Amino acid sequence: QNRFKKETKTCSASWPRAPQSTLCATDRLELTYDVYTSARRSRTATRLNLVFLHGSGMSKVVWEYYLPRLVAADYAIDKVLLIDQVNHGDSAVRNRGRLGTNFNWIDGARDVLKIATCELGSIDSHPALNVVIGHSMGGFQALACDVLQPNLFHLLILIEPVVITRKAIGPPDSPQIPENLYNSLRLKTCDHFANESEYVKYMRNGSFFTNAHSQILQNIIDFERTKGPVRTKMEQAQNLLCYMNMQTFAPFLISNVKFVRKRTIHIVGARSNWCPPQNQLFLQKTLQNYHLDVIPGGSHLVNVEAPDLVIERINHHIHEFVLTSPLQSSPQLTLEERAVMFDRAFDSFKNEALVK
Amino acid sequence: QNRFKKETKTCSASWPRAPQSTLCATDRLELTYDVYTSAERRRSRTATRLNLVFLHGSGMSKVVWEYYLPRLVAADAEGNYAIDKVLLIDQVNHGDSAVRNRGRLGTNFNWIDGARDVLKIATCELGSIDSHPALNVVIGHSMGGFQALACDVLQPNLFHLLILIEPVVITRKAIPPDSPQIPENLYNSLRLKTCDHFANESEYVKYMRNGSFFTNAHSQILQNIIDFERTKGPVRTKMEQAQNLLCYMNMQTFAPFLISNVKFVRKRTIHIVGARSNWCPPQNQLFLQKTLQNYHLDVIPGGSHLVNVEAPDLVIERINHHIHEFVLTSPLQSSHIPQLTLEERAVMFDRAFDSFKNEALVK
């Protein structure tokens, strides 16, 4: 990858959090993320900033393949942030010993805002258009980010977002998972192995990633490896914990999607059965500014199995977005100049607001 | 005031914000606040720290709470608690924050933005491992009552008890559907009672005592206001008139979001109101009553909408009463920092996961 400078940074996680997010109340979690910075730029040229949020049980690495193939300068990509949630990837490894049983996806959205807010907040970034792309869990979190902070992201891209789930066949918001789904998730989320041969053999034949793009599958295998026996960065308990708690935070988001006014792209795999039909029909009737793309042939993991197709769509919508987008100011003003501007701003506002 | 150590701190405001919060997009706002810290950590090992956060109403400042400090809940012999921190905050366009921010404020002051400011400060001030075990209380008046509720919505794991004094949430529709609107009648009379410059000292004190909103405040609080707002011959106040009026012109751009989310505020919420208040309509109070799961109403006999500055003694008795009942019913309260090894932690976790698995499994 020769297009961006890569820097890996680490900071403290958002606080406070859900009860039992951590093993002890005095513990404090951390987040690790990768910042890709652009390496021409005119005065009046919009900076695009992209934030990619991985799905349940994966990591920031699944998006590495995307970096060389994202939208060509026509505007120009200035930053890309690839984030690992507290209990996935490198954040999982920092946080070893400290995670509890209660991983709340909205807490995770607060993490994303904390990083994004700081990384994209420099006077230097202006004028900026910010884009959030999320898969599965990450799709949910993209929406939650806007709800909690509706002035950061201009465009949302949801790839197989998980928001409304199937109710199992037998307090009203208690955590629940069906035994059948638990037992099979367990079979496909193993995390320790007698040796390297067995590790690679499982990843290629028993994991969730067996049909991933070989480049992405190879990226996963080398990223998760840790040390003879081999242990993955993703911990099995945490992986399973990503599916056992929806009832404790999904209603809050479900109730607030009607306030997400942003252009929202919903990319789905034609062959996905992962969420029920209610999930997609809900996002369709509730988001004011909605567009659906169906990737022919695609599964729920369409983002790692057919990335070329997904990239083409990301590039298409970023590109159409940037065009329709207003300008774009790109001002040494004295206190006296400012007081004059303000009085004038106030008067115009007064005339719009006054009801005679 | 001899009970706490006073420190005045200043930090950058939450970002991003609503469009036109600032005069220019490259501008950045700041907040000033006062932290009062307890001077006697006495404190036993197992003694709950009480942290209070006070949010002023529209057009006022952090100063209106200074009279409260010496009269707040006494450390309790049997009960086992004590006030550790009190935070008095000035919103970006009030008081000392107004003065820092001179030249940068725009026309769009959005109350939820203000709640994001409060979380930013509170989060950082109350986040020390030192503060544990802590019970945190948010008290707000008018605009601040709205913001207390917004703080919980945006971050439901910080405040344990909410106290709302004359919260402004639902307002009267005047005679796009979410455009800013204010009725000319209300504007013209707000204007007459929010003046901010004066020929001289005599004229300044004369208006504050006879034409401002504060003419019936407790004399101590009225004096505190006068001395705090004074800035310099002609006399200009810290509170700017345009910003004052701007606090009443924008509700429709953010009220709906909070209205729709009060159903998620599970915390014990105290709603204190003035028996004589006509400021909000009936729908405002009846809405909070049907929607907050855990609700208690106190009516202060004789009280107006500014019941917090006009009859503070009565309001303080109620604050002290609810904090006191709250702390009793409250669970314990671990208190020790626990030297645990990675290996001890992996054992604790596997056990935690197993209990959670059994609760969550549906056979």
XYZ file of C-alpha atoms in Angstrom:
719
model
C 0.000 0.000 0.000
C 1.825 3.112 -1.306
C -0.845 5.767 -1.222
C -1.098 6.851 2.449
C 1.289 7.243 5.405
C 0.259 4.682 8.051
C 0.294 5.564 11.757
C -0.992 3.434 14.614
C -2.251 5.342 17.625
C -3.752 4.437 20.997
C -6.020 6.319 23.429
C -8.293 5.857 26.386
C -11.826 4.584 25.695
C -15.011 6.488 26.351
C -16.206 6.626 29.937
C -18.539 5.944 31.695
C -19.825 2.695 30.144
C -22.514 0.031 30.641
C -22.342 -1.897 33.953
C -19.972 -4.840 33.713
C -18.290 -3.539 30.514
C -15.147 -4.189 32.524
C -14.286 -7.004 34.914
C -13.782 -4.414 37.723
C -15.342 -0.942 38.155
C -11.913 0.720 38.642
C -10.619 -0.726 35.308
C -10.289 1.522 32.249
C -10.432 0.372 28.655
C -8.319 1.492 25.663
C -8.719 1.669 21.915
C -6.119 1.141 19.196
C -6.704 2.489 15.680
C -4.816 3.097 12.410
C -4.755 6.527 10.737
C -3.974 6.703 7.012
C -2.983 10.190 5.933
C -2.772 11.486 2.383
C 0.663 12.234 0.987
C -1.364 19.073 -5.532
C -4.158 19.996 -3.008
C -5.578 23.329 -4.253
C -6.905 26.016 -1.872
C -10.600 25.220 -2.644
C -10.434 21.370 -2.648
C -12.659 19.326 -0.341
C -10.957 16.892 2.007
C -12.738 13.498 2.155
C -12.302 11.617 5.428
C -13.394 8.004 5.707
C -14.160 6.039 8.890
C -14.492 2.207 8.545
C -16.141 0.160 11.295
C -15.683 -3.602 11.257
C -18.386 -6.190 11.941
C -18.824 -8.579 14.868
C -15.863 -10.884 15.400
C -13.591 -9.291 12.816
C -11.105 -6.338 13.046
C -9.849 -3.200 11.344
C -7.759 -5.405 9.029
C -10.662 -6.495 6.804
C -10.564 -2.977 5.267
C -6.854 -2.941 4.331
C -7.606 -4.318 0.857
C -9.893 -1.315 0.291
C -7.224 1.337 0.694
C -5.579 1.265 -2.754
C -8.915 0.981 -4.575
C -10.895 3.787 -2.944
C -12.130 6.798 -4.885
C -9.424 8.431 -7.055
C -8.707 12.131 -6.609
C -10.979 13.731 -9.256
C -11.804 16.348 -4.118
C -9.330 13.873 -2.548
C -9.115 11.413 0.358
C -7.242 13.099 3.168
C -7.646 10.666 6.123
C -8.935 7.137 6.525
C -9.527 5.772 10.070
C -9.629 2.001 10.639
C -10.856 1.320 14.213
C -10.768 -1.823 16.445
C -13.564 -1.950 19.031
C -12.469 -2.452 22.660
C -12.900 -6.244 22.470
C -11.636 -6.939 18.918
C -8.176 -7.006 17.306
C -5.379 -4.934 18.774
C -7.754 -3.255 21.266
C -8.605 -6.706 22.542
C -4.887 -7.362 23.164
C -4.386 -4.021 25.015
C -7.456 -4.702 27.079
C -6.582 -8.323 28.054
C -7.790 -9.016 31.603
C -10.134 -5.970 31.754
C -13.177 -6.755 29.582
C -16.425 -7.798 31.250
C -19.496 -9.563 29.952
C -21.595 -6.490 28.935
C -20.471 -5.202 25.501
C -23.009 -2.525 24.527
C -22.827 -1.443 20.872
C -23.778 2.222 21.722
C -20.748 2.354 24.067
C -18.773 1.326 20.958
C -20.294 4.165 18.953
C -19.198 6.563 21.757
C -15.641 5.156 21.173
C -15.810 5.913 17.459
C -16.990 9.499 18.115
C -14.185 10.018 20.624
C -11.512 9.003 18.059
C -13.244 10.565 15.000
C -14.023 13.768 16.831
C -10.412 14.271 17.744
C -8.853 13.073 14.484
C -11.145 15.113 12.186
C -11.403 18.215 14.410
C -8.333 20.153 13.312
C -8.837 23.566 11.634
C -6.447 21.978 9.123
C -9.185 19.415 7.977
C -11.552 22.255 6.830
C -13.400 22.162 4.454
C -14.263 18.503 5.049
C -16.796 15.929 3.955
C -16.788 12.970 6.380
C -18.002 9.490 5.490
C -18.783 6.580 7.812
C -18.842 3.041 6.368
C -19.892 0.178 8.674
C -20.575 -3.582 8.339
C -22.955 -5.631 10.527
C -22.350 -4.405 14.092
C -20.481 -1.452 12.504
C -23.517 -0.498 10.434
C -25.541 -0.202 13.646
C -22.762 1.930 15.163
C -22.611 4.288 12.159
C -26.287 5.077 12.754
C -25.717 5.430 16.532
C -22.849 7.880 15.881
C -25.126 10.223 13.965
C -27.862 9.940 16.663
C -25.492 10.906 19.468
C -23.620 13.516 17.330
C -25.531 14.543 14.182
C -22.908 17.143 12.999
C -19.879 14.913 12.142
C -20.755 12.542 9.245
C -22.224 13.848 5.989
C -22.793 10.443 4.409
C -23.504 7.013 5.914
C -22.760 3.698 4.130
C -24.287 0.618 5.756
C -23.123 -2.825 4.559
C -25.479 -5.518 5.894
C -26.320 -3.489 9.040
C -27.713 -5.600 11.912
C -30.420 -3.549 13.673
C -33.658 -5.636 13.924
C -33.069 -9.306 14.785
C -35.211 -12.467 15.021
C -37.035 -13.041 18.333
C -36.261 -16.598 19.628
C -39.035 -19.145 20.058
C -39.337 -19.001 23.913
C -37.783 -8.195 32.178
C -38.778 -7.412 28.506
C -35.294 -6.118 27.602
C -33.194 -8.943 29.118
C -30.260 -10.393 27.137
C -31.362 -13.500 25.201
C -29.854 -15.848 22.598
C -31.373 -19.086 21.199
C -29.410 -22.215 22.121
C -29.212 -23.303 18.454
C -27.571 -20.057 17.296
C -25.189 -20.119 20.274
C -24.005 -23.696 19.659
C -23.163 -22.998 15.988
C -21.566 -19.630 16.505
C -19.394 -21.530 19.053
C -18.311 -24.037 16.363
C -17.168 -21.213 14.029
C -15.414 -18.859 16.485
C -12.523 -20.961 17.874
C -9.547 -19.083 19.273
C -6.797 -21.589 20.313
C -4.978 -24.341 18.519
C -2.294 -26.947 19.180
C -0.023 -25.494 16.449
C 0.455 -23.393 13.285
C -0.767 -26.146 10.920
C -4.009 -26.545 12.913
C -4.478 -22.743 13.120
C -4.208 -22.205 9.351
C -6.284 -25.359 8.691
C -9.215 -24.108 10.805
C -9.020 -20.522 9.471
C -9.177 -21.835 5.921
C -11.786 -24.600 6.426
C -13.807 -24.035 9.645
C -13.910 -20.296 10.370
C -16.435 -17.756 9.052
C -13.854 -16.551 6.501
C -13.398 -19.650 4.232
C -14.870 -17.905 1.156
C -13.269 -14.498 1.785
C -11.125 -12.959 -0.989
C -7.791 -14.723 -0.696
C -5.994 -11.393 -0.060
C -8.405 -10.509 2.755
C -8.344 -14.091 4.135
C -4.526 -13.943 4.226
C -4.660 -10.524 5.968
C -6.981 -11.953 8.633
C -4.760 -15.058 9.249
C -1.583 -12.998 9.737
C -3.312 -10.315 11.800
C -5.001 -12.650 14.284
C -1.982 -14.916 14.889
C -0.451 -14.609 18.378
C 2.022 -16.803 20.304
C 3.961 -24.166 19.985
C 0.193 -23.326 20.440
C -1.436 -20.452 18.567
C -4.102 -18.147 20.046
C -6.112 -15.555 18.114
C -6.469 -11.873 18.992
C -10.255 -12.243 18.871
C -11.285 -14.096 22.002
C -14.107 -16.642 21.654
C -16.106 -15.491 24.694
C -16.117 -11.890 23.409
C -17.028 -13.003 19.917
C -20.053 -14.876 21.300
C -20.813 -11.909 23.633
C -21.340 -9.756 20.503
C -24.562 -11.754 19.821
C -25.988 -12.187 23.358
C -26.948 -8.573 24.397
C -28.972 -6.851 21.617
C -32.053 -6.408 23.698
C -30.121 -4.149 26.086
C -29.395 -1.440 23.449
C -31.228 -2.080 20.124
C -34.499 -0.377 21.199
C -32.779 2.953 21.830
C -31.371 3.042 18.317
C -34.535 1.650 16.677
C -36.444 4.534 18.314
C -34.028 7.186 16.967
C -33.313 6.213 13.324
C -36.115 8.679 12.356
C -33.652 11.482 13.369
C -30.889 10.393 10.970
C -31.351 12.876 8.152
C -28.172 12.076 6.303
C -27.885 10.424 2.913
C -27.749 6.747 3.881
C -26.567 3.980 1.549
C -27.776 0.449 2.369
C -25.703 -2.212 0.601
C -26.991 -5.791 1.005
C -26.092 -9.275 -0.259
C -28.789 -10.803 -2.502
C -28.299 -14.185 -0.803
C -28.247 -12.989 2.845
C -30.710 -14.553 5.349
C -28.774 -13.248 8.386
C -31.248 -10.530 9.392
C -34.956 -10.992 8.842
C -36.926 -8.971 6.208
C -38.174 -6.614 8.983
C -34.625 -5.315 9.409
C -34.317 -3.965 5.915
C -37.936 -2.844 5.557
C -37.559 -0.854 8.789
C -34.512 1.069 7.611
C -36.382 1.746 4.335
C -39.545 3.275 5.878
C -37.693 5.254 8.568
C -34.581 6.874 6.967
C -35.657 10.064 5.138
C -32.901 9.869 2.529
C -32.353 6.238 1.636
C -30.869 4.198 -1.241
C -30.632 0.400 -1.528
C -27.919 -1.498 -3.492
C -28.261 -5.260 -3.837
C -24.918 -7.014 -4.644
C -25.891 -9.989 -6.860
C -24.573 -13.280 -5.407
C -23.611 -11.742 -2.081
C -23.888 -13.133 1.436
C -23.933 -11.361 4.822
C -20.120 -11.228 4.626
C -20.334 -9.593 1.210
C -17.774 -6.990 2.368
C -14.953 -9.641 2.634
C -16.210 -12.163 0.010
C -16.819 -9.774 -2.911
C -14.939 -6.589 -2.033
C -14.401 -5.410 -5.621
C -18.184 -5.140 -6.084
C -18.662 -3.317 -2.768
C -15.802 -0.867 -3.537
C -17.430 0.065 -6.914
C -20.552 1.095 -4.989
C -18.678 3.011 -2.246
C -16.820 4.859 -5.009
C -20.074 5.540 -6.914
C -21.959 7.110 -3.987
C -19.030 9.093 -2.583
C -18.635 10.451 -6.107
C -22.304 11.412 -6.663
C -22.407 12.853 -3.110
C -19.456 15.137 -3.584
C -21.064 16.704 -6.704
C -24.473 17.640 -5.261
C -22.610 18.978 -2.205
C -22.699 22.748 -1.457
C -19.555 24.932 -1.351
C -17.133 24.961 0.698
C -15.649 28.206 2.093
C -11.951 27.077 2.255
C -10.526 34.684 7.699
C -8.454 37.150 9.756
C -11.409 38.987 11.347
C -11.137 41.621 14.090
C -13.464 41.791 17.101
C -15.023 44.889 15.536
C -15.542 43.198 12.163
C -17.087 40.208 14.006
C -19.539 42.352 15.996
C -20.777 43.916 12.768
C -21.183 40.486 11.101
C -23.026 39.127 14.111
C -25.555 41.993 14.453
C -26.376 41.453 10.859
C -26.643 37.657 11.373
C -28.914 38.231 14.393
C -31.213 40.568 12.545
C -31.766 38.132 9.653
C -32.428 35.371 12.180
C -34.845 37.569 14.137
C -36.936 38.273 11.006
C -37.176 34.539 10.122
C -38.099 33.612 13.731
C -40.571 36.401 14.570
C -44.288 35.539 14.411
C -46.424 38.703 14.275
C -17.636 30.089 51.840
C -15.245 28.027 54.020
C -16.236 24.428 53.308
C -14.635 23.657 49.844
C -11.499 24.624 47.913
C -12.530 26.698 44.848
C -10.723 26.310 41.505
C -11.707 27.896 38.205
C -10.756 25.887 35.115
C -11.214 26.353 31.383
C -11.296 23.877 28.479
C -12.259 23.538 24.851
C -15.966 23.072 24.007
C -17.480 19.999 22.450
C -17.098 19.706 18.710
C -18.659 19.436 16.156
C -21.727 21.614 16.890
C -24.892 22.826 15.129
C -24.394 24.920 12.013
C -23.828 28.583 12.826
C -23.070 27.871 16.516
C -20.031 30.029 15.769
C -19.701 33.111 13.598
C -17.100 31.314 11.444
C -16.717 27.555 10.775
C -12.971 27.633 11.730
C -13.797 29.208 15.160
C -13.644 27.059 18.285
C -15.582 27.661 21.477
C -14.499 27.323 25.130
C -16.164 26.709 28.474
C -15.215 28.086 31.890
C -16.350 26.295 35.062
C -15.742 26.293 38.818
C -14.823 23.080 40.686
C -15.403 23.025 44.424
C -13.439 20.222 46.094
C -13.968 18.836 49.590
C -11.278 19.706 52.112
C -11.324 16.586 54.289
C -10.740 13.292 52.396
C -12.447 11.976 58.131
C -13.382 10.137 54.835
C -13.513 6.433 55.756
C -12.518 3.666 53.322
C -16.174 2.698 52.631
C -17.742 6.203 52.316
C -19.648 7.222 49.202
C -18.471 10.357 47.440
C -21.354 12.633 46.369
C -20.644 14.769 43.303
C -23.024 17.524 42.342
C -23.342 19.224 38.938
C -25.459 22.419 38.780
C -26.725 23.772 35.441
C -28.027 27.366 35.359
C -31.137 28.552 33.477
C -31.535 30.715 30.391
C -29.943 34.141 30.767
C -28.254 33.504 34.124
C -24.854 32.012 35.079
C -23.040 29.619 37.393
C -23.196 32.320 40.118
C -26.864 31.725 41.016
C -25.737 28.513 42.808
C -23.050 30.079 45.047
C -25.584 30.663 47.815
C -26.318 26.903 47.795
C -22.814 25.695 48.599
C -22.820 26.290 52.385
C -26.296 24.881 52.874
C -26.082 21.629 50.937
C -26.465 18.226 52.561
C -24.271 17.796 55.643
C -21.912 14.796 55.818
C -24.037 12.110 57.574
C -22.872 10.262 60.751
C -24.897 7.057 60.119
C -25.624 6.955 56.369
C -21.909 7.225 55.504
C -21.623 9.922 52.742
C -20.144 13.355 51.978
C -19.986 15.925 49.182
C -16.673 15.542 47.370
C -17.025 17.718 44.242
C -19.454 20.389 43.136
C -19.207 21.627 39.503
C -20.844 24.974 38.594
C -20.810 25.360 34.766
C -21.247 28.417 32.463
C -22.722 27.488 29.050
C -20.717 28.786 26.038
C -22.845 31.922 25.688
C -23.357 32.761 29.387
C -21.192 34.282 32.114
C -17.446 33.829 32.002
C -17.684 31.490 28.978
C -19.499 34.283 27.206
C -16.511 36.575 27.925
C -13.896 34.016 26.681
C -15.959 33.406 23.583
C -16.491 37.144 22.643
C -16.504 37.477 18.902
C -17.013 33.780 18.177
C -20.657 32.948 18.987
C -23.154 32.538 16.147
C -26.911 32.682 16.055
C -27.631 28.907 16.552
C -27.408 27.935 20.246
C -28.651 24.336 20.467
C -29.360 23.091 23.983
C -28.249 19.499 23.230
C -24.857 20.944 22.139
C -24.821 22.441 25.639
C -25.562 19.069 27.183
C -22.551 17.690 25.179
C -20.428 20.403 26.888
C -21.631 19.369 30.359
C -20.832 15.700 29.607
C -17.346 16.710 28.374
C -16.567 18.560 31.631
C -18.389 16.098 33.991
C -16.927 13.111 32.293
C -13.428 14.324 32.802
C -13.856 15.775 36.305
C -15.665 12.766 37.783
C -13.696 10.054 35.880
C -10.751 9.629 38.227
C -10.239 6.194 39.881
C -9.899 8.452 42.963
C -13.670 9.416 42.755
C -14.777 5.750 43.243
C -17.196 4.819 44.741
C -19.292 7.765 43.612
C -22.934 8.767 43.356
C -23.384 11.629 40.889
C -26.286 14.105 40.980
C -27.281 16.591 38.242
C -29.443 19.607 39.255
C -30.765 21.913 36.528
C -33.061 24.920 36.230
C -35.114 25.883 33.118
C -32.737 25.356 30.215
C -30.556 23.383 32.639
C -33.382 21.027 33.452
C -33.716 20.118 29.763
C -29.935 19.645 29.592
C -29.848 17.358 32.668
C -32.328 15.069 30.844
C -30.291 15.326 27.601
C -27.104 14.319 29.475
C -28.701 11.046 30.564
C -30.046 10.357 27.047
C -26.632 10.821 25.439
C -24.696 9.111 28.308
C -26.952 7.050 30.620
C -24.109 5.804 32.908
C -22.878 9.042 34.579
C -25.736 10.506 36.736
C -27.547 8.467 39.380
C -30.178 11.038 40.386
C -31.692 13.926 38.372
C -33.186 17.040 39.993
C -35.193 19.293 37.680
C -36.213 22.776 38.873
C -38.835 24.276 36.513
C -37.485 22.347 33.506
C -38.407 23.890 30.115
C -39.172 21.043 27.667
C -42.623 21.525 26.079
C -43.379 25.152 25.092
C -46.488 27.042 23.854
C -47.100 27.000 20.075
C -47.544 30.634 18.849
C -50.830 31.630 17.235
C -40.576 23.567 7.433
C -42.382 22.142 10.575
C -39.217 22.412 12.739
C -38.211 25.993 11.884
C -37.161 28.367 14.645
C -40.178 30.499 15.779
C -40.899 33.029 18.572
C -44.070 35.160 19.038
C -43.520 38.883 18.590
C -45.224 39.576 21.947
C -42.857 37.347 23.945
C -39.821 38.763 22.064
C -40.667 42.412 22.725
C -41.026 41.785 26.499
C -38.007 39.535 26.834
C -36.136 42.438 25.162
C -37.379 44.883 27.838
C -36.034 42.669 30.657
C -32.622 41.532 29.279
C -30.738 44.832 28.805
C -26.928 44.632 28.765
C -25.400 48.174 28.581
C -25.784 51.261 30.711
C -24.535 54.814 30.874
C -23.021 54.284 34.340
C -22.842 52.431 37.662
C -25.951 54.122 39.118
C -28.032 53.198 36.055
C -26.695 49.590 36.059
C -27.617 48.877 39.689
C -30.949 50.701 39.233
C -32.011 48.483 36.306
C -30.741 45.252 37.924
C -32.776 46.035 41.045
C -35.939 47.474 39.348
C -36.187 46.300 35.692
C -34.299 43.010 35.319
C -35.750 39.483 35.849
C -34.055 39.288 39.248
C -35.860 42.043 41.230
C -37.399 39.583 43.693
C -34.383 37.274 44.034
C -32.980 36.610 47.510
C -30.904 39.705 48.299
C -27.734 37.579 48.650
C -28.310 36.010 45.235
C -29.315 39.361 43.669
C -26.114 40.926 44.966
C -24.072 37.970 43.644
C -25.591 38.437 40.217
C -24.898 42.231 40.133
C -21.220 41.864 41.062
C -20.665 38.882 38.739
C -22.215 40.440 35.605
C -20.533 43.843 35.968
C -17.864 44.523 33.340
C -16.096 47.762 32.313
C -17.868 55.150 32.657
C -20.423 52.823 30.932
C -21.222 49.358 32.336
C -21.759 46.282 30.142
C -22.958 42.889 31.413
C -21.364 39.478 30.810
C -24.656 38.204 29.504
C -25.177 39.662 26.059
C -28.718 40.662 25.107
C -28.744 39.016 21.679
C -27.605 35.680 23.160
C -30.120 35.966 25.951
C -32.948 36.355 23.401
C -31.334 33.612 21.276
C -31.969 31.203 24.170
C -35.745 31.501 23.413
C -35.782 31.509 19.592
C -34.627 27.998 18.602
C -36.531 25.339 20.596
C -38.135 23.722 17.620
C -34.700 22.783 16.199
C -33.862 20.497 19.172
C -36.839 19.969 21.513
C -38.376 17.077 19.550
C -35.280 14.910 19.892
C -35.335 15.112 23.671
C -39.143 14.814 23.903
C -38.875 11.526 21.965
C -36.209 10.118 24.321
C -37.381 10.968 27.848
C -38.921 7.466 27.918
C -35.283 6.153 28.148
C -34.408 8.138 31.312
C -34.733 5.434 33.959
C -33.106 7.362 36.766
C -34.848 8.710 39.824
C -35.975 12.154 38.650
C -37.151 14.871 41.040
C -39.357 17.578 39.434
C -39.531 20.760 41.634
C -42.004 23.437 40.484
C -43.332 26.770 41.656
C -47.037 26.719 42.572
C -47.501 30.135 40.902
C -45.622 29.370 37.644
C -47.335 29.973 34.256
C -44.062 29.998 32.282
C -44.557 26.561 30.680
C -47.965 25.225 29.739
C -49.653 22.287 31.589
C -48.518 19.923 28.810
C -44.897 20.421 29.836
C -45.382 19.070 33.358
C -47.975 16.424 32.449
C -45.597 15.060 29.786
C -42.693 14.564 32.168
C -45.117 12.903 34.652
C -46.474 10.262 32.205
C -43.128 9.519 30.569
C -40.465 9.323 33.311
C -40.700 5.787 34.883
C -39.379 6.938 38.290
C -40.844 10.337 39.071
C -41.522 12.558 42.087
C -43.164 16.022 42.086
C -42.535 18.731 44.733
C -44.583 21.941 44.532
C -42.972 24.917 46.364
C -45.944 26.895 47.762
C -45.789 30.563 46.629
C -43.074 29.867 44.040
C -42.627 31.337 40.545
C -40.606 30.064 37.571
C -37.469 31.628 39.158
C -38.190 29.691 42.374
C -34.495 28.708 42.485
C -33.302 32.322 43.034
C -36.450 33.754 44.735
C -36.911 31.078 47.439
C -33.628 29.144 47.616
C -33.993 28.001 51.248
C -37.151 26.056 50.312
C -35.509 24.484 47.237
C -32.365 23.534 49.235
C -34.517 21.667 51.842
C -35.907 19.554 48.992
C -32.504 18.974 47.372
C -31.170 17.849 50.760
C -34.199 15.641 51.374
C -34.009 13.696 48.075
C -30.232 13.330 48.052
C -30.614 11.958 51.585
C -33.371 9.454 50.816
C -31.486 8.467 47.621
C -28.211 7.645 49.358
C -29.981 5.265 51.802
C -31.864 3.053 49.298
C -28.633 2.935 47.264
C -26.732 -0.384 46.845
C -23.178 -0.920 48.136
C -20.436 0.301 47.116
C -17.264 -1.810 46.663
C -14.655 0.808 47.750
C -11.275 -1.129 47.388
C -8.856 -1.119 44.416
C -8.179 -4.831 43.848
C -4.620 -5.951 42.974
C -5.633 -8.746 40.549
C -3.227 -10.731 38.329
C -3.977 -11.585 34.712
C -4.475 -15.184 35.825
C -6.866 -14.241 38.646
C -8.786 -12.100 36.110
C -9.117 -14.923 33.510
C -10.629 -17.132 36.179
C -13.057 -14.404 37.306
C -14.076 -13.755 33.747
C -14.758 -17.381 32.693
C -16.963 -17.659 35.734
C -18.695 -14.316 34.828
C -19.215 -15.515 31.238
C -20.725 -18.794 32.330
C -23.307 -17.121 34.595
C -24.139 -14.752 31.743
C -24.436 -17.618 29.263
C -26.986 -19.423 31.485
C -29.150 -16.264 31.878
C -28.976 -15.534 28.113
C -29.536 -19.068 26.697
C -33.012 -19.940 25.383
C -33.386 -23.727 25.029
